Amino acid sequence: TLRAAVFDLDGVLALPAVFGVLGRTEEALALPRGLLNDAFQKGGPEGATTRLMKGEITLSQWIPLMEENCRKCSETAKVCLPKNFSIKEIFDKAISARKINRPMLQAALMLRKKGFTTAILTNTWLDDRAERDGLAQLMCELKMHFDFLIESCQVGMVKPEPQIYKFLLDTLKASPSEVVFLDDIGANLKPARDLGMVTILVQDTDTALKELEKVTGIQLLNTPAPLPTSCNPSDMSHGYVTVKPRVRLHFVELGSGPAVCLCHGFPESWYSWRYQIPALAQAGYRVLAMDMKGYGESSAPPEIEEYCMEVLCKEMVTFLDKLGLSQAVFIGHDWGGMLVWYMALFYPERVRAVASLNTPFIPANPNMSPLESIKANPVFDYQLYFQEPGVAEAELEQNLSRTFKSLFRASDESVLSMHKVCEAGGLFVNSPEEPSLSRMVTEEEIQFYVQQFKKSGFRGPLNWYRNMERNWKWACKSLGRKILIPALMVTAEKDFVLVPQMSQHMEDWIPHLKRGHIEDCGHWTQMDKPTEVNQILIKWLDSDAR
Amino acid sequence: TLRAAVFDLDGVLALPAVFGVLGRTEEALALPRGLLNDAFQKGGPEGATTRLMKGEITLSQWIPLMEENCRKCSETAKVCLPKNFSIKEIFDKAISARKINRPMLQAALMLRKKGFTTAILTNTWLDDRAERDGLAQLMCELKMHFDFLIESCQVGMVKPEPQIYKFLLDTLKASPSEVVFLDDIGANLKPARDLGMVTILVQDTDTALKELEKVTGIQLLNTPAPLPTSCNPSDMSHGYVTVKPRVRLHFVELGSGPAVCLCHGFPESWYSWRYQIPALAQAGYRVLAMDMKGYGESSAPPEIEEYCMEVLCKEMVTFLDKLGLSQAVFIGHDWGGMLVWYMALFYPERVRAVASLNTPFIPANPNMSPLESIKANPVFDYQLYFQEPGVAEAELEQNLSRTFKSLFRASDESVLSMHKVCEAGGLFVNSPEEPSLSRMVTEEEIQFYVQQFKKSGFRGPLNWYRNMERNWKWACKSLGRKILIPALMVTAEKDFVLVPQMSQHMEDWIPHLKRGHIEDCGHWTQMDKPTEVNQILIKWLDSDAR
Ligand SMILES: Oc1ccccc1CNCC[C@]12C[C@H]3C[C@H](C[C@H](C3)C1)C2
Ligand SMILES: Oc1ccccc1CNCC[C@]12C[C@H]3C[C@H](C[C@H](C3)C1)C2
Ligand SMILES: [Mg+2]
């Protein structure tokens, strides 16, 4: 029956409400209880505030008008407004103190997830204050989660005029008995009830959600901690830079602030960063999530030499050049992790800070060829299988769905042993044709990967494994150096290839190395434990990179 | 005969040279003349500094080694190094005091313009200082102008070892007698002379360029003030955002810092901003230059209503949303200028600062329909001609080359009178088939525009002129407000349509309005007088928007 949920901003999706500054200021300054609310409301439908809410006048135009009303009100209540009394001040402070009511957003999210059309309907104002960006930021953080945002000052109507509820219904394409509307102000509920909407008067958050729980029949309170916000590919800004004649690099870009460049592993995609991209933009950073050379919409020349790290690196530098970026933070996972450590070692002027998930930094051994080295660790048997051009492409390109459904699994979900891959004759030799879906990924998320790899298959991705000798010669040049720029290493308890212990010597080369560690976390760090990864990266960024 | 020019960085493309801090520090601290240079040079080919220049060790690794050398040197010269003596300090200060030697860059530019292959060959170091970004920035500003940048610490060789000159020749694909090489250090010239290169010892800049002038036979000193740096379209990062199902917006993006969004006029393109894009990135800003709805690689639906400003504006806001930008600076020209004033009036929370070239802000007249209004100013006769869907498309799409070659002209170059366009039957009725090239544009720059308009022609661009009544109704909503956010108006003496006097009332609606004025400047502000426009925008941005 119910199909739509409507939330007010002030007092409902954001707290404390700014009305509750008129109350507290009055107490705090020992003025007549209600004096400020009366001045705020002066003149009713024709007073300064309604014209503000209707978009007739801007906030800065209103400030003095409210001032005059506060003067009138005090003259007739025979009190003095204090010295240095400032409506700009009271309102600046109130407006920057309002934060998202997290439990309320979360409930909105959940109902949107079970199919409700959600909307914010709010009496707001055209904000031209010097400090207006604060409110611009909150509104951005809020609106992305809703189907509609209806602002009094944009549509020229206000709660509780009946016409805005008609505007609302018409926007939702819903009849009034299909709608729950929450407000903290009863008068604003009134006309919604007249049309027969379910209404909720929001005093404390928990009680409003309990009423919301009961009326929608959807569990909203006490629910499991939800995932971080993900990316809808076709809502992203997509960016393309030609770093040289045959080679273009694609990336997705979100946020303002210091540039932070995410480098995915084998065989992944910018999409592997879907859970970090919102949260880092949110935490004040300019996220550039790449398709690394060989994948997705980035170019994928055939030749093996196009994928040695010396060339991959120079290319990432050119990418900064053409974007006009002097530096960026490089954060990598798996292959991307190996590459960012080499960015630190060969171009520290370009790297603001370096971070890797799973991949330790390990120096070249100038005494031992790296193919020989590789045979010393059975767990790296798969890297030998990848050598012969053609062999691994054919297994991996055979069934793309099967491929990703097989590879992308939690630590307790593994359907393949990395043991004796060459002997057995393939990575998937003893795994299912139709593997169950991992708990980590939806059917759709697998298909996006599938579609990506339809562009260029696995030749380019595999080539990364095919320059061992050439990379070793180049790495040997870096044996005299240390990474002295800020740097974070994040180990994953249950990555059975890139085990935590592999990283135990890193302090010999990177003496001021910071660490973080995720428990019960397989190889696919970013989607396995997205929350924990976001917190470790944002805490490190705020301290080492800001 | 000569075909390539090679420049060192320190002392040649950047001044003061950092060697000249070893000299001045010695004086400044009253230490033995040459003590610091000796320590710097300690050990010759095997000492700390050469391994630094070869990329064996990073700058921060070297700092203490140089320290130890300064200790040895003072022990044997029987002097005391002062208290609080700091090589990190001396070097930080020296490195941030080096600036581009502008006249030297300009000469490099010029020779590149007359066909020389230009290169920077420099003994430099891997910079991992906390303050390394400064040098990252200078190197970016320098390298974009040259064919090659060869860095000692990247190639593992150093001046004056003979092998780097062999590496140089091989990079240039040139024989030694085709190359001029400038250095401030004679020893570094030595091996270039042995191979038979023309060499120049750079003491003062002017004398080196005079020698360079004579040997290349190219005027380099006393030359006319050159244009600002322009954009090569295929070297730009290109970005695309779907603001809604049928509609994608394209833009080019350069730089880091506060976001600055450039909105071109009718009938233009992001490319109209080619002269501002580098300079504003350079001045520390994140330039997003659009293709506005209807042009270039942005979508161009047929329907007239898709181009009223209410929709164009909402759409620009969505563009901020999807890019994760809470605000931007909006700077517009012509139609783009009209649109940004309305962005200020309807979404001041999203606009950090607003700027228009040529286009005054003019309020709607609520008493007079804007079609009627339009007949009151003969100079706007062309706007009536644009009304009838089909008519103006056909003239304008007939010969694209002729179209832009006709439209894009300096104030003293005009080949069409805006007078009685409807009467005459077209904009180009009495102009040439094959117009001369304006002094403002090259043949190639016309063809890029030509190619752009081949995608969607003039239907979308023209539609901007076709919502007069609808825009007027919407503008009327804004009659109560004032623009109180920072705002700049730039008038162009000789725009005969958008005359300076048209803007004379703007202070009634925008009381803190800043102004700038360009003399001898036609309608095509950005390419007519690019230098002057850059200086007015950067000065205003630094003061009102930073
Ligand atoms: O090889 C490198 C190179 C550099 C950095 C890290 C690694 C570690 N690579 C692990 C990549 C992996 C290989 C194989 C297929 C699929 C699932 C597992 C088995 C893990 C992806
Ligand atoms: O109409 C508007 C609307 C809004 C803002 C400014 C203007 C002013 N538009 C001037 C555009 C112009 C029209 C015509 C063809 C070509 C050469 C000149 C004659 C100038 C471009
Ligand atoms: Mg409320």
Ligand SMILES: [Mg+2]
């Ligand atoms: Mg020098």
